[PDB]
Amino acid sequence: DNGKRRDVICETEFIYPFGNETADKEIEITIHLKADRQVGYLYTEIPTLKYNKDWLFLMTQDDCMHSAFSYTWAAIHGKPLSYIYYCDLAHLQNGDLPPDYYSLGKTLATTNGTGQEVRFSFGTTVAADDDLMNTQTWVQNGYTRDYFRFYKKTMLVWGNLQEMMNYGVSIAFHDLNLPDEDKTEDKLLAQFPVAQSMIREKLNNRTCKMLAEPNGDKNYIKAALRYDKIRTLCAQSGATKLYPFQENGDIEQVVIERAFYDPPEGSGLTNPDMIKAAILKEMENPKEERAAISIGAHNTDTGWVNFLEWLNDTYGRDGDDSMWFTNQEEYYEYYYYRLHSKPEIKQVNTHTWKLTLNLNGEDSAPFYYPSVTVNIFGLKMGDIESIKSNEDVTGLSYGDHKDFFMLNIDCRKYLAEHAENFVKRYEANPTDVSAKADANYFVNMLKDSDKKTELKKRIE
Ligand code: NI
């Protein structure tokens, strides 16, 4: 019965198996050359930014906000949007949409430089030790007497966050659920693993490794530094300003600077206006001198939706494609790989070369973004007869970039199974255009294989 009110716990039907992700990857890519294209010497590097991007935009949305799902995630991923209301996942699943709903008509993305879409990525903080994440959602198709079921909740419900995990959204600690008088360094330290246990229980055993400092409270940074699961942190002050082409040290347990760009009072400007102005100023510098645009957000809204579209249209897929728009966790892992991994390429015979590198995350937990870019200097796509890869490589795209050759290598252990889960969702909702688009997006992440061919056929 479509018309009957239901009050449900929002749930998604699969979550990537973060707890099962392998910590250590061994990449072996065999490049067989055409007969009259024998090259003499090749050498390799991991570039400063993934996909050979010129500059970095980091986004972390604080306070575990409903709008992180209803506005930020929905706008990026081509989902129904509202101007004043706040959908939960169960509304989208059931087609119970607010009375002003609309869609942008596209996802918001860069490319990877080798012909594939990379949707914008961001992180949200989590109030995992707060029972308000267990709030129910009122679903009632066709009910128009009121729209109270679409009002802003005080925070994300778990199901919304669980679904966001399937799209690579990251997580961070923020406030912990203790009485204010108990927010001492020692008591916050004891409460971190309590919140972590709830994160792991709800997010298919993903371990949170980031702290976004709350309200300038340095007790959170001091406590977090004694909790070794936290590897990366952000704050507005007492931090390090990130210059991606200059930063040379370890950033393990380093507080990265992140700004909210609040507008002057009574100025009528918005946070997106301020960030846009900061971006324009920063782009006037050569890329090597640019700071990262490292932003925090609180509530996101229509102005933020339009700003994300502006980024897409200006520096993303529909503009100059120069930006890497990601979350701080993915960046942290990539920087770690660039510091510690050493790609090597060896000639096996006159026409065959073998590229190897290891991706090994830190001892605390499996890294969750085990993908890199490798550049090969001296090689062009036109030289290549075939490329093959070993089992640890699950996504592989490649092509020319400037005067060299680039490979985007994804080693997420369960990526093919994840794509198939999106295919199955489309098959169960074949009239949902967005479900089909998501299926195509995830299947296109896979390297060429029988499984990729099977899944493409299922989504023709
Ligand atoms: Ni906050």
Cα 216 to middle of ligand 1, angstroms: 9
Q: Are 369 and 168 within 8 A, CB to CB? A: yes
**HSE toward the beta carbon, residue 60, CA cutoff 13 A:** 30
Those residues whose C-beta lies under 8 Å from the C-beta of residue 63, and which sit 6 or more positions away, are 125, 127, 155, 174, 298, 299
| Residues written for the chain | 460
Cα dihedral 225, 229, 234, 240, rounded to 10, equals: 60
- Which of 305, 351, 357 is CA-nearest to residue 68? 305
Tokens of 258: 């992140």
Cα 310 to middle of ligand 1, angstroms: 26
Q: How far is the C-alpha of 108 from the C-alpha of 230, rounded, in Å?
A: 30
As to burial, measured by CB atoms within 10 angstroms (0-12 exposed, 13-18 middle, 19+ buried), residue 382 is: exposed
Helices (H), 241-327: 271-283, 302-315
Opening angle at CA 28, ends 27 and 31, nearest 5: 135
For CA atoms 69, 71, 76, 77, give the dihedral sign.
Answer: positive
Cα 215 to middle of ligand 1, angstroms: 6
- Which of 337, 439, 318, 419 is CA-nearest to residue 25? 337
Tokens of 392: 């640890």
As to burial, measured by CB atoms within 10 angstroms (0-12 exposed, 13-18 middle, 19+ buried), residue 295 is: buried
Cα 89 to middle of ligand 1, angstroms: 23
Cα 424 to middle of ligand 1, angstroms: 37
Q: What letter would DSSP give residue 292?
A: P
Cα 390 to middle of ligand 1, angstroms: 44
For CA atoms 46, 50, 51, 55, give the dihedral sign.
Answer: negative
Question: Which domain, by its residues, includes 437?
Answer: 1-460
Tell me which method was used to determine the 3D structure.
X-ray
Check the annotation: does 63 bind a ligand: yes
Cα 96 to middle of ligand 1, angstroms: 31
Q: How far is the C-alpha of 331 from the C-alpha of 254, rounded, in Å?
A: 13
163 Cα distance to chain centroid? 13
Q: How many domains does the chain have?
A: 1
Cα 104 to middle of ligand 1, angstroms: 29
DSSP 303-330: HHHHHHHHHHHHHSTTTT--EEEE-HHH
Cα 287 to middle of ligand 1, angstroms: 31
Q: Are 58 and 292 within 8 A, CB to CB? A: yes
Q: In the beta sheet, which residues pair with residue 240?
A: 256
As to burial, measured by CB atoms within 10 angstroms (0-12 exposed, 13-18 middle, 19+ buried), residue 322 is: middle
Those residues whose C-beta lies under 8 Å from the C-beta of residue 211, and which sit 6 or more positions away, are 172, 173, 174, 220, 221, 224, 230, 232, 233, 234
Check the annotation: does 298 bind a ligand: no
50 Cα distance to chain centroid? 13
Q: How far is the C-alpha of 10 from the C-alpha of 351, rounded, in Å?
A: 55
